Design a protein around this nucleic acid. Structure first.
Ligand SMILES: Nc1ccn([C@@H]2O[C@H](COP(=O)(O)OP(=O)(O)OP(=O)(O)O)[C@@H](O)[C@H]2O)c(=O)n1
Ligand SMILES: [Mg+2]
Ligand SMILES: [Zn+2]
Lengths: 251, 302, 66, 1319
RNA sequence: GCGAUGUGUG
DNA sequence: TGAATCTCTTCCAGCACACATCGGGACGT
DNA sequence: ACGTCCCGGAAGAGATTCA
């Protein structure tokens, strides 16, 4: 990685490899001069300890450190831990087409729909918008479309209504616990910058409006929209899966 | 703490009372954080052992079934038979207590109508099918899982019950944790009640009693798990209590008692070592300083 | 216990994802433990359908073909 | 009587308890500590002096050359604070040290050849402390939080239960030295005493005993008491002390000196011991079958030959008895070993000893310290001598020695800094004696064992580390002697010291970034007491008793202010009155109490000393003589607290506040809130953003004055005088005469700080509050800072609130705000962002800043000037270009407004690396700054000269007032004006010399400033020029922002409402915010309701004054009404009168009340329901405090009157336009092709592990597939998906997750082989 | 556009 | 002579944000 | 400077108690 400048901040794998290669080279040099036995023995031990560090630092005694005093990260640590590839990039992945904001109430909603600010909508459904623009023919290439949606000329709002009308979006609240932590809603464009949420659903999200934040995702493919409508809609969940008693109880 | 606050927010609080309240609230916060960590780790473990489990067949075709009875703690029946066996496939047909009048066939789904029938006909034991004894390979058949929740009808073929189960178990551990504070620092403590105050006319039934008749003509209990029960005037079991060791029974077994008739009486802060024989006492293997210690009352001189 | 019944599993990508990886990988290595997909977390790691719902219908199709 | 500024708004003040100690200066910790660090203190005693006198003189190997110390000095800083913030340097001062170098003579006694003083060798830099108590490091302003760590000394801990799973407690004694190696003693479940050192492996404590050069006989004689048997004809008369006749059954019929006195079997009772004592006999007679259970004391050899009979510490038997009997050793010594008095612990440990003598002992020590290497005799000897006895590598502080000698129950509290044989032995004796039953453990939470460092002590330790490295260097270069061909500028090396002190102030868990968005935030972040960091404990090893609160905190550390979250209780905040001891402990005030009279003489007490005394409590009614009013009064003695006698107390608390902190004592009605809500109130009040028009709180707690005056944000006048000139930039005060020096006369000038940037981007600003021609007194405000109103801490603004449900728009907590608020711009806060743009010359060529940009438009360039930098004032929006920058290829790389933020550009800085040419706008700004500097210094000289000449004109009235010859000539020609032969011409000499010195200092400072502004800069290696730009965003309020009260009532403002819909009251005025009733009895903070009522009282009085002032009312009426309002209440302290207000000050007092009569309420000695009812009823408001309200929509009445009042509400810098964010397609990470994370980087969210579980729990599977294959990772997949979308065909084609492919590559790079079998 | 520490949110 | 039980060593300890600073010195041309 | 280096829980394996 290049930091700000012509300097490269330390990278732990390359460090470990560099160490092992230096030890290997020096010991290769000793084994062409009939070197003395104590020195070749000491150097074999150094190479062994270096490879042990490389494979799995720290399982031996005092782990090496590179910055000042923190053990640098070896391959077993690229895999293990709360931050190995398993629990960090193969189960929970960062996702495109997402977004987030603060929630607020708006009691004028039918319970199968949620407000969603204009700017988040126009930022999330950009590809769909491009499609509909160059389908109507208001812009030939893709770059004309990009200019138009960036300048926010007054056609994109009608375009955006038509690409929203019947298109569920998944709302989520941060510490998701039970399978009601993700639900679907149909969007309704709003002014302002806060996601509005029907009041009979804070019981499920455990969301008071004292500043909670909710994240929205967009289902892309057609099967996925049908799932967000037939399995994850807000209406389709009016009974908790733990106990039978309702979970849309007025609060 | 053994020094309770004796004032309420509408009244002031002097500084000391408020300081004690601080003890309490910092309990609240600390426990939220750390016990949150615990509960989260718990749900993780659960959903990683209960994962590879998916309803896969419409009917295994067996006959094992666990038993289901109402659960009582000593007051009102806590979780009655209707609440326990709502929505679960009956293993073996329930005979009306008019024996040989088979009331429900042996693969019905006890939905709400059947629960009302069971409640009317006053049944207190149903043998019902259960996942733990389902004979399907690699999964669980539909019926043996019983009624789905979150939907009325029976479970479908696919709905991954492993994960939903693991979450619904581990969830209210976390949700209550991160909330345990905003009751305040109050102390959810209840006394042992020191006596079993029966509530309604009925008869008595003891289970696992090994008693003995003390000098004063009473009956003390020298058995560990002794469980007392109040039966009603129709045969139904209405009450169950845990009578601790060494407690004093008023009435023996099989005697009609009525309401408000204290039957048991013990000391809630002492596990006595009551005998069963009568005679003199010698200390065996009791050497001072090594095992026992020998204190003396200045006041009584003893 | 649960935190043992999850490790002593037929698959090993599951175990590897759960709570330690050194032990599971070394053991699975020395035994050559071939792992099928057969479950949910394995199929998610590898990134395909999940034999849970809609995915369950798909896996009917797939196991039928093979 | 009052300070003339106070007579501008004299706050009504409830509160019954008369105070006696004013609030101390709230930054004593930081300021005194650094001032103590950096100051020429003689006689050593905690300074740079101390570090130097402890490390110097550095002597070679007696190489007839030695480096010694003289004195030190600090230059002036090169850059004053403001320039330093602008540029990025450390506000530092050089360190010039006088080091002498003596050169002795070879072939001679210790005589010198020639000594030399390379005067003021330079070394390092040390960052000075700004007056506020904050350090500047790199253009930012950083703060060092004091640390609360365990006191160097000895502690006898228990560690009960857990270990050994048998309930057998252990007892480990630790010696914790302030600098060096630990030392630990601990038992085993085998009652063996084992030592360890630096928590390494374990050793037998007797090994260190006789590594101190003892012998086993000596050891036993030190630890155990002897027992004497005397060989005689009849049964070896034993010496029997009655003390050894307790608890057991003697093994014989006890007679001696005649008749039987204590018969066998009769367990010896106390009366039996009394019999024995009255018997006057200790020479008694014993059986022989008893000694079999004893151990011999010292060695017994055979006196006929000279060989060992039995060695010391060996048990006995009849054969050995006879063998040592043949030689006739008539007296034999053994060890009295009761299992209840004196366990043979040293005995057993000696038996377990695997060692022999000093040699083998030191061998073992070495072998267990530095493992696996030859145990050379000299090596082990030097090692052990240099672990606990060398002045270099081991040292207890003087505090160490104090706490040590105190805990050992020694006598004096001074001594050497190293341990000693006797000290280790006393530690061991105390440990064993604890094991027996006398003595107690020392709990650690007890504030008699923690200790507060601060900047002084920590910076001194780091500087000492720097010095040990420089001594290595100096000694190394000096031992290679060279006669005189060098001097002490090359033998030294400033670089290690500089690097060390830089490292400390920059990179640490303590020296951190100051939350500088709110005067309260500054002043409660400086007074913080962290328990983390180096030397202290860590959150993962953090126990739990330490997170609990402890009874010694009462009045030393705030109970109800701790940061909730990952580290609770470790980050205590300090109390209000608390101080640092002389040694470092936290002491607190009290009031001395003689017999029954509470003297007003204060008296500071530490932690431990608080225990011995009985202390009364501050809310005890005492009657006008220092006498208590009861005869039994609540008090606290040692942890406990109950009702004691009248004539037994010894100290009464000072004031009812001293239990809380500054952060918590600004909450009214605290004693009505749950502690959790008090805590959340403290935090939210710390997070409140300043506003555009500051406004006092109607209902405060009087601590605003101290906080706002001592927070520094305001400009407290120093010498009381008369205001001569006010102006939104500066304020120029004439000084009263009797408050001035003979010379140096002049006048005072305060340069206010106009709109500039804080660390949280809020706009720090100042405004003159005093108008021209107005007295000011010493210690008084002139400039409102950010969120200060007439010198009161006004964070938020007070709004008319009414508790009621209202069409759900406040369902959970969602405050509902009427449009009246947003119209009157009473939350329109100001931010100021800082945008940078660097220019670098790299391979392929440099990067220009020309206005010409490839593929842009004249509209997109108009706001740029002829160089490429925007004007000052160009109201840019999101997307525009601020600085046109291109890269060689040529590619657009300009700087642009971050998307979403509007606002005005207010300032542009340009830095050019020395050597590169300056462009035309850089020259423009150069000359602008030059002319500003010239005009400012010229104003200095001109106004100051005006003052001086005015004073001279005042002088020459007596002594030759010559009006003509005085105004004839230019006033500067006053060398020889007609004045008698007196001292007044000498005084004119004084003033004229001051004038000439002003001349020359103006000249020299102007020249230096021109040099500063002319010169180039020093910048990052690899940069050419930097262009900094500031914006001024004006963020309104809008549905989404977070407002909060002061009691945990948070809430996201949900719907803005038109003025009509607000529930207007019975008179017309529409309530301005609707809260939610259901929030109170759940969130048990009943405090805010009383705050509301009392505010409504205050504003009722305010409107009554407003009417009496609009209808002009013959100020007698105002006087009557104001007087009644100030005299209302029960027995209170205020007692103001309005017959001493000159009948015009009263008009101004009403002018400043017409917004509403403010009210105080000190924290716990506050108002009561009765007093609020009485005040409301003084107003024309209903007693209940509830009014009928009418609905704005339907116009028909509400049922059941509702609560209205004025609650003081706050904004919070958690704004919706800084939280909202959205990503459709942006960058991608580099190693695992996934989208980045965060908002700055245009990242998407984290569909996390539990969300994957939620989707698995549903039946959804296609959603999850596209959620972690296409939307995220697989590259072929998502390009094909993007195209399928832009064609209208919604369909996915999965492929495989790239990060999974990476997992394969790693598992494969290990030895393992993971593959993918064929289908 | 990497990782550390830190403060602060739900 | 072998099976308990005491000692030491590895492995884990909730989720999602937001923002800030800061990234290695030591010697021949 | 440029260039080129230096804490509960549990399971293994002592080791100590039965003979
Ligand atoms: N370590 C934490 C802290 C907080 N939360 C989230 O914060 C919520 C609690 O919010 P909080 O405001 O702290 O308490 P509430 O009772 O919900 O609201 P209030 O504090 O105003 O009473 C929890 O449900 C949880 O979702 C969390 O998940 N993990
Ligand atoms: Mg909350
Ligand atoms: Zn089955």
């Amino acid at each position: 990685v290049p930091l700000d400048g012509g300097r490269f901040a330390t990278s732990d794998l390359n460090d470990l490899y560099r160490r092992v290669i230096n030890r290997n080279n020096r010991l290769k040099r000793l084994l062409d001069l009939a070197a003395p036995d104590i020195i070749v023995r000491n150097e074999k031990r150094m190479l062994q300890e270096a490879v042990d560090a490389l494979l799995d630092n720290g399982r031996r005694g005092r782990a090496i450190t590179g910055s000042n005093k923190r053990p640098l990260k070896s391959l077993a640590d690229m895999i293990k831990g709360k931050q190995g590839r398993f629990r960090q990039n193969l189960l929970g992945k960062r996702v495109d087409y997402s977004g987030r904001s603060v929630i607020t109430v708006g009691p004028y909603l039918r319970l199968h729909q949620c407000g969603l600010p204009k700017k988040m909508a126009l930022e999330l459904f950009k590809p769909f918008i491009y499609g509909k623009l160059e389908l109507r023919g208001l812009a030939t290439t893709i770059k004309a479309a990009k200019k138009m949606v960036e300048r926010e000329e007054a056609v994109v709002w009608d375009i955006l209504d038509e690409v929203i009308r019947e298109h569920p979006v998944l709302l989520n609240r941060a510490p998701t616990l039970h399978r009601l932590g993700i639900q679907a809603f149909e969007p309704v464009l709003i002014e302002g910058k806060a996601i509005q949420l029907h009041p009979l659903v804070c019981a499920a999200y455990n969301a008071d409006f004292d500043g909670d934040q909710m994240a929205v995702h967009v289902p892309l493919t057609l099967e996925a929209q049908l799932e967000a409508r037939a399995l994850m809609m807000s209406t389709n969940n009016i009974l908790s899966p733990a106990n039978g008693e309702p979970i849309i109880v007025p609060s | 703490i053994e020094t309770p606050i004796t004032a309420n927010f509408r009244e002031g609080l002097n500084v000391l009372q408020y300081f004690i309240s601080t003890h309490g609230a910092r309990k609240g916060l600390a426990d939220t954080a750390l016990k949150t960590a615990n509960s989260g780790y718990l749900t993780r473990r659960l959903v990683d052992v209960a994962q590879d489990l998916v309803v896969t067949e419409d009917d295994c075709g067996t006959h094992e079934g666990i038993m289901m009875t109402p659960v009582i703690e000593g007051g009102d029946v806590k979780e009655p038979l209707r609440d326990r066996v709502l929505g679960r496939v009956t293993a073996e047909d329930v005979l009306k207590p008019g024996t040989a009048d088979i009331l429900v066939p042996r693969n019905t789904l006890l939905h709400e109508q059947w629960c009302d029938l069971l409640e009317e006909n006053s049944v207190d034991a149903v043998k019902v099918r259960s996942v733990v004894s389902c004979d399907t390979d690699f999964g669980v058949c539909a019926h043996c899982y019983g009624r789905d929740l979150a939907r009325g009808h029976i479970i479908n073929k696919g709905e991954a019950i492993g994960v939903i189960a693991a979450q619904s178990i581990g969830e209210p551990g976390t949700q209550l944790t991160m909330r345990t504070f905003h009751i305040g620092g109050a102390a959810s403590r209840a006394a042992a009640e020191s006596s079993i105050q029966v509530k309604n006319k009925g008869s008595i039934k003891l289970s696992n009693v090994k008693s003995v008749v003390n000098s004063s003509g009473k009956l003390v209990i020298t058995s560990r798990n002794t469980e007392l029960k109040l039966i009603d005037e129709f045969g139904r079991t209405k009450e169950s209590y845990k009578v601790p060791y060494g407690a004093v029974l008023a009435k023996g077994d099989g005697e009609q008692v009525a309401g408000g008739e204290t039957v048991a009486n013990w000391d809630p802060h002492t596990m006595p070592v009551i005998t069963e024989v009568s005679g003199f006492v010698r200390f065996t293997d009791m050497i001072d300083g090594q095992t026992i210690t020998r204190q003396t009352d200045e006041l009584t001189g003893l | 216990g649960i935190t043992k019944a999850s490790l002593a599993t037929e698959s090993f990508i599951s175990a590897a994802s759960f709570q330690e990886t050194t032990r599971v990988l070394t053991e699975a290595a020395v035994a050559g433990k071939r792992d099928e997909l057969r479950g949910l977390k394995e199929n998610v790691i590898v990134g395909r359908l999940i034999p849970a719902g809609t995915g369950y219908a798909y896996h009917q199709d797939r196991m039928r073909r093979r | 009587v009052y300070s003339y500024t106070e007579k501008k708004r004299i706050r009504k003040d409830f509160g019954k308890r008369p105070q006696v100690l004013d609030v101390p200066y709230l930054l004593s910790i930081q300021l005194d500590s650094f001032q103590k660090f950096i100051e020429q203190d003689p006689e050593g005693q905690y300074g740079l002096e101390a570090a130097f006198r402890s490390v110097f003189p550095i002597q070679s190997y007696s190489g007839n050359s030695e480096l010694q110390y003289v004195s030190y000095r600090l230059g002036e800083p090169v850059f004053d604070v403001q320039e330093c913030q602008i540029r990025g340097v450390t506000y530092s001062a050089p360190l010039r040290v006088k080091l002498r170098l003596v050169i002795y003579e070879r072939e001679a006694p210790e005589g010198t050849v020639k000594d030399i003083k390379e005067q003021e060798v330079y070394m390092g830099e040390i960052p000075l402390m700004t007056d506020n108590g904050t350090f500047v490091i790199n253009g930012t302003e950083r703060v060092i939080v004091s640390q609360l760590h365990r006191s160097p000394g000895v502690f006898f801990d228990s560690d009960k239960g857990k270990t050994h799973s048998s309930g057998k407690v252990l007892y480990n004694a630790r010696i914790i030295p302030y600098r060096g190696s630990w030392l630990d003693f601990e038992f085993d479940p085998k009652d063996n005493l084992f030592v360890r050192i630096d928590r390494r492996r374990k050793l037998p404590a007797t090994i260190i005993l006789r590594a101190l050069n003892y012998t086993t006989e000596q050891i036993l004689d030190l630890f155990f008491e002897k027992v004497i048997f005397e060989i005689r004809d009849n049964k070896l008369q034993m010496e029997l002390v009655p003390e050894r006749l307790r608890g057991e059954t003697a093994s014989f019929d006890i007679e001696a000196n005649g008749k039987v006195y204590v018969e066998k079997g009769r367990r010896i009772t106390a009366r039996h011991i009394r019999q024995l004592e009255k018997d006057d006999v200790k020479l008694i007679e014993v059986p022989v079958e008893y000694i079999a259970g004893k151990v011999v004391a010292k060695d017994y050899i055979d006196e006929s030959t000279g060989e060992l009979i039995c060695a010391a510490n060996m048990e006995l038997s009849l054969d050995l008895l006879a063998k040592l009997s043949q030689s006739g050793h008539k007296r034999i010594e053994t060890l009295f070993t009761n299992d209840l008095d004196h366990g043979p612990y040293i005995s057993e440990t000696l038996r377990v000893d695997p060692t022999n003598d000093r040699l083998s002992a030191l061998v073992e020590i070495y072998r267990m310290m530095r493992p696996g290497e030859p145990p050379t005799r000299e090596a082990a000897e030097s090692l052990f001598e240099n672990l606990f006895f060398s002045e270099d590598r081991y040292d207890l502080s003087a505090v160490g020695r104090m706490k040590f000698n105190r805990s050992l129950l020694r006598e004096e509290i001074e001594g050497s800094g190293i341990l000693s044989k006797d000290d280790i032995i006393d530690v061991m004796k105390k440990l064993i004696d604890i094991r027996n039953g006398k003595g107690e453990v020392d709990d650690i939470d007890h504030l008699g064992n923690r200790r507060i460092r601060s900047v002084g002590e920590m910076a001194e330790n780091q500087f000492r580390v720097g010095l040990v490295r420089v001594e290595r260097a100096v000694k190394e270069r000096l031992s290679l002697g060279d006669l005189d061909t060098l001097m002490p500028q090359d033998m030294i090396n400033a670089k290690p010291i500089s690097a060390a002190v830089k490292e400390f102030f920059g990179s640490s868990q303590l020296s951190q970034f100051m939350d500088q968005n709110n005067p309260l935030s500054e002043i409660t972040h400086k007074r913080r007491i962290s328990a983390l960091g180096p030397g202290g404990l860590t959150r993962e090893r953090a126990g739990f008793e330490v997170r609990d609160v402890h009874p010694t905190h009462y009045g030393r550390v705030c109970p109800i202010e701790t940061p909730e979250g990952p580290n609770i209780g470790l980050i205590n905040s300090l109390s209000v009155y608390a101080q640092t001891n002389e040694y470092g402990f936290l002491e607190t005030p009290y009031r001395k109490v003689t017999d029954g009279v509470v003297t007003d003489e204060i008296h500071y007490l530490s932690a431990i000393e608080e225990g011995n005394y009985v202390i009364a409590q501050a809310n005890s009614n005492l009657d006008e003589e220092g006498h208590f009013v009861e005869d039994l009064v609540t008090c606290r003695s040692k942890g406990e607290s109950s009702l004691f006698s009248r004539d037994q107390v010894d100290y009464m608390d000072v004031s009812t506040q001293q239990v809380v902190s500054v952060g918590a004592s600004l909450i009214p009605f605290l004693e009505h809130d749950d502690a959790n809500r008090a805590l959340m109130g403290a935090n939210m009040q710390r997070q409140a953003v300043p506003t555009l028009r500051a406004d006092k709180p109607l209902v405060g707690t009087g601590m605003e004055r101290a906080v706002a005056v001592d927070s520094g944000v305001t400009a407290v006048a120093k010498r009381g005088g008369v205001v001569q000139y006010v102006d939104a930039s500066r304020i120029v005060i004439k000084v009263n005469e009797d408050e001035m020096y003979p010379g140096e006369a002049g006048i005072d000038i305060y340069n206010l700080t106009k709109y500039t940037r804080s660390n949280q981007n809020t706009c720090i600003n100042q405004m003159p509050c005093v108008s021209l021609g107005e007295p000011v007194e010493r210690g008084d405000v002139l400039a409102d800072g950010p969120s200060t109103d007439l010198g009161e801490l006004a964070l938020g603004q007070n709004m008319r609130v009414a508790f009621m449900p209202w069409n759900g728009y406040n369902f959970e907590d969602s405050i509902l705000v009427s449009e009246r608020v947003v119209q009157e711009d009473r939350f329109t806060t100001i931010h100021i962002q800082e945008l940078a743009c660097v220019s670098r010359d790299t391979k392929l060529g440099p990067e220009e800043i020309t206005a010409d940009i490839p593929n842009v438009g004249e509209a997109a360039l108009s706001k740029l000037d002829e160089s490429g930098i925007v004007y000052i004032g160009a109201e840019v929006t999101g997307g525009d270009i601020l600085v046109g920058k291109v890269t060689p290829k040529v590619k657009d790389s300009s700087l642009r407004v971050p998307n979403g933020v509007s606002g005005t550009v207010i300032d542009v800085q340009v830095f050019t690396r020395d050597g590169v040419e300056k462009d035309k706008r850089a020259l423009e700004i150069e000359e602008m700054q030059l002319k500003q500097a010239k005009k400012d210094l010229s104003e200095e000289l001109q106004i100051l000269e005006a003052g001086l000449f005015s004073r001279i004109r005042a002088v020459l009235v007596a002594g030759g007032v010559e009006a003509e010859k005085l105004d004839k000539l230019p006033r500067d020609r006053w060398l020889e004006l007609g004045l008698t032969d007196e001292e007044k011409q000498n005084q004119l000499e004084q003033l004229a010399e001051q004038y000439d010195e002003l001349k020359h200092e103006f000249e020299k400072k102007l020249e230096a400033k021109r040099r500063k502004i002319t010169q180039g800069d020093d910048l990052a290696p690899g940069v050419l020029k930097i262009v900094k730009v500031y914006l001024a965003v004006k963020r309104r309020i809008q549905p989404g922002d977070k407002m909060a009260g002061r009691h945990g009532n948070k809430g996201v403002i949900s719907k803005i409402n038109p003025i009509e819909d607000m529930p207007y009251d019975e008179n017309g005025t529409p309530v301005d915010i609707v809260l939610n009733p259901l929030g109170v009895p759940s969130r048990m903070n009943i405090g805010q309701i009383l705050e509301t009522h009392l505010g409504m009282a205050a504003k009722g009085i305010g409107d009554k004054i407003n009417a009496m002032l609009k209808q002009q009312q013959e100020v007698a009426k105002l006087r009557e009404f104001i007087q009644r309002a100030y005299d209302l209440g029960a027995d209170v302290r205020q007692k103001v009168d309005l017959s001493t207000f000159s009948d015009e000050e009263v008009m101004r007092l009403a002018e400043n009340l017409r917004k509403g009569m403010p009210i105080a309420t000190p924290v716990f000695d506050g108002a009561k329901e009765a007093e609020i009812k009485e005040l409301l009823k003084l107003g024309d408001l209903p007693t209940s405090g509830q009014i009928r309200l009418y609905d704005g929509r339907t116009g028909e009445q509400f049922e059941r009157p509702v609560t209205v009042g004025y609650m003081y509400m706050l904004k919070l810098n958690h704004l919706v336009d800084d939280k909202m964010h959205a990503r459709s397609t942006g960058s991608y990470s580099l190693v695992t092709q996934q989208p980045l994370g965060g908002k700055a980087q245009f990242g998407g969210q984290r569909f996390g592990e539990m969300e994957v579980w939620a989707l698995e729990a549903y039946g959804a599977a296609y959603t999850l597939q596209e959620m972690l294959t296409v939307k995220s990772d697989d590259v072929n997949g998502r390009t094909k998906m993007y195209k399928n979308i832009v064609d209208g065909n919604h369909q996915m084609e999965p492929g495989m997750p790239e990060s999974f492919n990476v997992l394969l590559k790693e598992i494969r790079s290990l030895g393992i082989n993971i593959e993918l079998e064929d289908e």
